[PDB]
Write a protein that binds this DNA or RNA. Structure first.
Ligand SMILES: [Zn+2]
Length: 748
DNA sequence: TAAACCAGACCGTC
């Protein structure tokens, strides 16, 4: 016992199950001096916490933005990313106190964090710079003061859409003196949400043009493939990308781990959960600060329970905490603060800590399986690192085909560049909604460009629908309606369910939240809800009022459930037949039958019983485009057919979002071996947004191009048969590429 | 898989 971190690294270097060891070289801090033009008060205030020099990226950001060139920097929060935009903004306000700035954060909690840091930095100076947040949580009594006195206004894209722009006449103070627009995590604004936010930015730019100000955009993004391009397409201005990371970095060991095989005939490996529990045990017992990511909320709670039980003998009780989005605000702000100050030794988290919140800088990262994407893997890995010491990142794979392929071929992960962020701000639905909003704000002249080109046709269409009216050359708002209130930027999300502890009537308290869709299987009438190790049992799920009345409970087991998802075609309104192929387009419904739930003993993971789930069949009514394979009696084997359809669906999931310029989560591609109406093998592609937003329609239009791009992708990737980047490894035969390509050629 | 957001201002009433 009593080992150090280097001793633990050696014990992992040898005598282990490691399948790859990737060493990331240290980096000495590269710096430039504090600019002379910086206000003396700001230089003294930055002497606090030892910021007498600037990193190369911080200095480069300040210099680019001083000239007026908009920038996007790929700088982690640990490398001093907030200074890259706080320095120019605070400098500009210190020079001329009449200057203002908008900060755009993807969440309200991040806005609060940035306000707090800005308040500290400002208080260290002698200047009276007022910063405020203006979001749905801002009480309306203070909003009047905020519109007037706020030098720095910290908002959401959603609040900007819904509150600030449609009431620009109430914000004249900053729109006339706007110098900087900060966008904190650009990569979150991708896909359909990214399209909405791009149009919101267009409206903000026209508002700023009206008040005679052309602010400069300072953006931050994660390490995606196209940060400069996403920033340019999102803000509509040319961007200067800031690459170099002048922050100091130590040695980093990113290691691949494959759990041992427990039975050789049945060919079954040990759970990544158990190996992760024991690895984090050996690291936490030696007082090494560790983060553990897991793929789901239930598995996060499982790992918390196991780790705390097997570590409290040596470490104690109050050193390991959990983290997931369903936690209360106060509760997880406390968790973040504890991780930052260093008095929380370990944390078991979902992907929620991929967000650039300031939780300090961990020593060890343990991933329970591949996070899902290369970008997520690298961002999860960046949570472990030191200014000068060493750090480990253990990716413990599980039984997934993708995990096992990443294990058996580590060069496939280390050579692949991160994924790309694609938006299409010219989606007809989105562009029409935001054109109505923009016309409500300012009368929209016909020849003035909104983004790329002119858009007089949609203006004429809106005039025809009694919503706009042309006077001279400008289209005025001709409707009694407020458009911004009817348009949600992220209409995927709905109201959440609130978890209410009724354990005693005198201290009834709200303990957490959960999205409505997940509560069907996680909060049903007898489920067990695990809140950071605290056990509750759902007494009753008030589904219509989105409430879950629960009580405190101590049991041996936990609850899990899975949804039986079926898809039905309603009416087929478009179709195209070609030999052994027929591609239809129509309306479909996605039903989720809850069926049953399982009791699983927490300690042994054994099944100890089951139960029923009486909940309404949640259904999505949405447009879809499907292809079915017309076959002769000279058919193919059933299981071979399911494998082939699975491969085609993988290639479609790869190609469709790339060609239609959306995100992988914006469209769902499902496969059926025998559809209900036809009995033929069918692949459906449908956008999950309510009602639909033209993704399936564009897929039906360009499906021939999609199939050709799919064939090209299958032919050109350097794989032996299939990889997760093309058709997948689940195909068992030895001629996977050939069979899939034949089905594609037959699908002309 | 997880996670996230949403007029200003006045009127009518207790
Ligand atoms: Zn491949």
């Amino acid at each position: 016992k009593k080992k150090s971190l280097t001793e633990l690294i050696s014990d992992l270097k040898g005598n282990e199950n490691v399948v790859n060891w990737h060493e990331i070289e240290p980096r000495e801090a590269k710096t430039r001096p504090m600019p002379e033009s910086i206000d003396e008060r700001i230089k003294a205030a930055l002497s606090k916490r030892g910021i007498d020099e600037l990193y190369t990226h911080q200095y480069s950001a300040f210099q680019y933005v001083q000239k007026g060139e908009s920038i996007v920097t790929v700088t982690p929060t640990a490398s001093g990313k907030t200074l890259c935009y706080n320095l120019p903004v605070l400098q500009s306000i210190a020079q001329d106190e009449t200057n203002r700035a908008l900060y755009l954060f993807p969440t309200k909690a991040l806005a609060q964090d940035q306000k707090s840091e800005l308040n500290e930095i400002i208080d260290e100076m002698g200047i009276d710079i007022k910063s405020f947040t203006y979001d749905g949580d801002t009480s309306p009594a203070i909003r009047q003061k905020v519109r007037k006195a706020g030098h720095i206004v910290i908002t959401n894209p959603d609040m900007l859409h819904s509150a600030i722009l449609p009431h620009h006449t109430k914000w004249v103070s900053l729109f006339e003196n706007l110098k900087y627009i900060v966008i904190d995590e650009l990569h979150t604004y991708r896909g359909v949400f990214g399209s909405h936010v791009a149009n919101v930015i267009r409206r903000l730019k026209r508002i700023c043009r009206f008040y005679g100000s052309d602010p400069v955009f300072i953006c931050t993004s994660a390490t995606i493939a196209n940060p400069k391009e996403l920033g340019e397409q999102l803000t509509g201005k040319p961007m200067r990308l800031v690459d170099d990371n002048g922050a100091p970095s130590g040695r980093k060991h990113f290691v691949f781990y494959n759990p041992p095989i427990v039975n050789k005939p049945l060919n079954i490996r040990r759970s990544a959960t158990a190996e992760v529990n024991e690895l984090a045990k050996e690291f936490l017992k030696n007082k090494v600060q560790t983060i553990v990511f897991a793929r789901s909320r239930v598995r996060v709670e499982i790992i918390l329970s196991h780790i705390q039980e097997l570590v409290k003998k040596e470490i104690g009780t109050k050193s390991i905490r959990g983290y997931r989005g369903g936690y209360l605000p106060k509760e997880r702000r406390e968790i973040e603060r504890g991780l930052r100050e260093g008095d929380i030794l370990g944390v078991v988290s979902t992907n929620a800590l991929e967000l650039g919140v300031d939780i300090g800088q961990l020593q060890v990262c343990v991933m329970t399986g591949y996070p899902g994407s290369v970008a997520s893997a690298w961002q999860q890995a960046g949570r472990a690192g030191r200014r000068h010491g060493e750090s480990l990142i253990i990716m413990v794979a599980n039984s997934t085909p993708i995990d096992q392929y990443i294990v058996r071929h580590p060069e496939y992960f280390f050579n692949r560049s991160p994924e790309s962020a694609r938006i299409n701000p010219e989606n007809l639905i989105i562009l029409v909604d935001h054109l109505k909003c923009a016309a409500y704000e300012l009368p929209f002249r016909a020849d003035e460009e909104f983004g790329a080109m002119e858009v007089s046709d949609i203006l004429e269409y809106l005039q025809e629908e009694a919503v706009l009216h042309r006077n001279g050359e400008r289209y005025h708002w001709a409707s009694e309606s407020f458009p911004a209130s009817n348009i949600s930027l992220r209409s995927a999300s709905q109201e959440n369910v609130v978890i209410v502890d009724q354990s005693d009537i005198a201290n009834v308290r709200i303990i957490g939240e959960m999205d409505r869709f997940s509560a069907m299987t996680l909060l049903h009438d007898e489920a067990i809800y695990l809140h950071e190790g605290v056990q509750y049992q759902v007494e009753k799920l008030d589904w219509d009022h989105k409430k879950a009345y629960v009580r405190k409970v101590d049991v041996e087991y936990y609850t899990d459930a899975n949804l039986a998802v079926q898809l039905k075609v309603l009416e087929i309104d478009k179709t195209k037949e070609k030999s052994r192929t027929s591609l239809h387009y129509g309306d479909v419904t996605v039903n989720a039958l809850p069926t049953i739930f399982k009791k699983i003993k927490m300690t042994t993971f054994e099944n100890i019983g089951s139960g029923p789930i009486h909940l309404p069949e949640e259904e999505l009514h949405t447009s879809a485009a499907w292809l079915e394979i017309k076959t002769a009696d000279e058919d193919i084997g059933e299981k071979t057919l399911e494998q082939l359809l699975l491969g085609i669906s993988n290639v479609l999931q790869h190609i469709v979002p790339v060609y239609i310029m959306c995100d992988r989560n914006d469209v769902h591609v499902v496969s059926q071996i025998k559809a209900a109406h036809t009995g033929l093998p069918t692949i459906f592609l449908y956008d999950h947004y309510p009602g639909g937003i033209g993704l399936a329609e564009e897929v039906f239009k360009r499906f021939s191009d999609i199939n050709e791009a799919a064939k090209q992708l299958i032919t050109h990737c350097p794989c032996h048969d299939g990889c997760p980047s093309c058709i997948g490894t689940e195909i068992e035969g030895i001629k996977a590429k050939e069979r899939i390509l034949q089905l594609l050629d037959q699908m002309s």
